[PDB]
């Protein structure tokens, strides 16, 4: 490791036996530049700027995950089949900008210390589940090898909201509350 | 709860003073245990835990595998930095500063990059949140206080907001 | 000019 001017992951490669599933994404200074939809075989950049000027071949991703799948098989045997331990994630909710009644905003649900990277994050306007207006990031890497994931909800401030998180490291599902 | 075996590979570059110092580290990780790595500073593969020797001993025994991982400093690090230089590193984003009592909070919302300097005009009886990350290339930082002058690399003249 | 990327080494059978 280091404490350098700019830290970049040109390949957060991820693959797990459960599913099975995997993730390929590049990061710069702790933010996600793009992930690759492994089933759609399409490089999905995360800023318009990047979409206008940067190109990455999804094939390099699919190749890399093929290696992880094999690699995982040998390390499973060598580790005498040592399974991943579930972590207890922490959840924070906050707004992209200060709240003004009748001014469009975005709620931001930070799910932190995710391991394994398998999670449900679902928003709640009162008791009801919000289907539309939701977006999220991929699992972003932490130097302690766990992940964080941020979910977003565009909303109109009115006269309550809940971020509902399901994870194997929790007993019951966790709901973090937020009101204006 | 369902059983799971997790694998991670972390090809990381480290840049200092432009590229006057470049360094790569690739990390092979079983679940959360990094077991083998390649540091461009060492120049060979090394076992990080007793889970690594078989992999590292085998990887150093292939010239091809060595030279190629070594070369990734040019073909991954140096090669991508030019493309960061064109894009990421010119992404200057103007912050938004307002003041609201709760203490009178000087919240500084939506800016890039991280390097920022908020101070109260010029006594210090203050409290400040860690540098919050939105996950979409903007940062939040609320600086509580029991005129707010905010300095960010993107602003020519520093932003000054009176009470 | 496309993006470079690291490639993981094969674990040994």
């Amino acid at each position, epitope marked *: 490791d280091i404490v350098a001017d700019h830290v970049a992951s040109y390949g957060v490669n991820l693959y797990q036996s459960y599913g099975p599933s995997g993730q390929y994404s590049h990061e710069f200074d702790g933010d996600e530049e793009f992930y690759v939809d492994l089933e759609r075989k399409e490089t999905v950049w995360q800023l318009p700027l990047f979409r206008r000027f940067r190109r990455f*071949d999804p*094939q*390099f991703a699919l*190749t890399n995950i*093929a*290696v992880l*799948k*094999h690699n995982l098989n040998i390390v499973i045997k060598r580790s005498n089949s040592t399974a991943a331990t579930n972590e207890v994630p922490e959840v924070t909710v906050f707004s992209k900008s200060p709240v003004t009644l009748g001014q469009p905003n975005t709620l931001i649900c930070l799910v932190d210390n995710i391991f394994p990277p398998v999670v449900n994050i679902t928003w709640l306007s009162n008791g009801h589940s919000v289907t539309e207006g939701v977006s999220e990031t991929s699992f972003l890497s932490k130097s302690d090898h766990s992940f964080f994931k941020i979910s977003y909800l565009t909303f109109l401030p009115s006269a309550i909201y809940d971020c509902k998180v399901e994870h194997w490291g929790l007993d019951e599902p966790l709901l973090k509350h937020w009101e204006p | 709860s369902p059983e799971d075996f997790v694998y991670q590979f972390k090809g990381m570059c480290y840049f200092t003073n432009g590229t006057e110092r470049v360094r790569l580290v690739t990390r092979y990780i079983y679940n959360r245990e990094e077991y083998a790595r390649f540091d461009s500073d060492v120049g060979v593969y090394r076992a990080v835990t007793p889970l690594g020797p078989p992999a590292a001993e085998y990887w150093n025994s*292939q010239k*091809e595998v060595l*030279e*190629r991982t070594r*070369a*990734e400093l*040019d*073909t991954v690090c*140096r*090669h991508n930095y030019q493309l960061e230089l064109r894009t990421t590193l010119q992404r200057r984003v103007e912050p938004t500063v307002t003041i609201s009592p709760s203490l009178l909070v000087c919240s500084v919302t939506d800016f890039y990059p991280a390097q920022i300097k908020v101070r109260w005009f010029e006594t210090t009886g203050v409290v400040s949140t860690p540098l919050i990350r939105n996950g979409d290339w903007t940062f939040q930082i609320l600086v509580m206080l029991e005129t707010c002058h905010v300095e960010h690399p993107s602003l020519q003249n520093p932003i000054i907001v009176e009470w | *000019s*496309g993006e*470079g*990327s690291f*490639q993981p*080494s*094969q674990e040994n*059978p």
Partner: T-cell receptor
Amino acid sequence: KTTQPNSMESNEEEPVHLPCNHSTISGTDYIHWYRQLPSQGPEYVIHGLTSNVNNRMASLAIAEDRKSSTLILHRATLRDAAVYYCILRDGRGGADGLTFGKGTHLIIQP
Amino acid sequence: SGVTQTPKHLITATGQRVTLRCSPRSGDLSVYWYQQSLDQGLQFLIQYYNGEERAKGNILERFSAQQFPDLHSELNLSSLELGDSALYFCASSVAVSAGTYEQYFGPGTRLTVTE
């Protein structure tokens, strides 16, 4: 695309310099040289990225601007008379780069 | 090198379908299929890594391949045509990539397709 001379003759015992052009080489591209004896299948000679590389088979001189290269064989015998392909591959691999082109017929006569 | 391939020589009528076998180097995990023709040079067809398909080239729909669990591969050429008369090469690689690794080739199949 790479471009190479169609044919090339050199005497036995003498060094041979086989030329190859590739003006649009990328920063992520490696240069590969393979040979193929008439009856036999093809076989790896050498590969490189920058400056000079030498294995127990041959030497490879890549130009300063990386837009050309030279496969050098220090001593050539009848057993080195074969076809020589010059290939650009991405260090990472993938389809576009596996296919061998026309190559060069290197004739070795006494 | 240590790449075996069968059958060495092959003569078949048009419209027919034959299958070419290849066992790669013992330590290796990749197989590449190539077609060398007088007019096309040494063309890449299809690559398999660790059992599943990895890279496709200019394989016709009339062509089919796969890599089995023991890592050997088969290549079937359906509705054989005159122009399909070519030299067919199997290749082997330790890893998924040949960008920085060498490829070890087999003897190849000599296939003529006659009227």
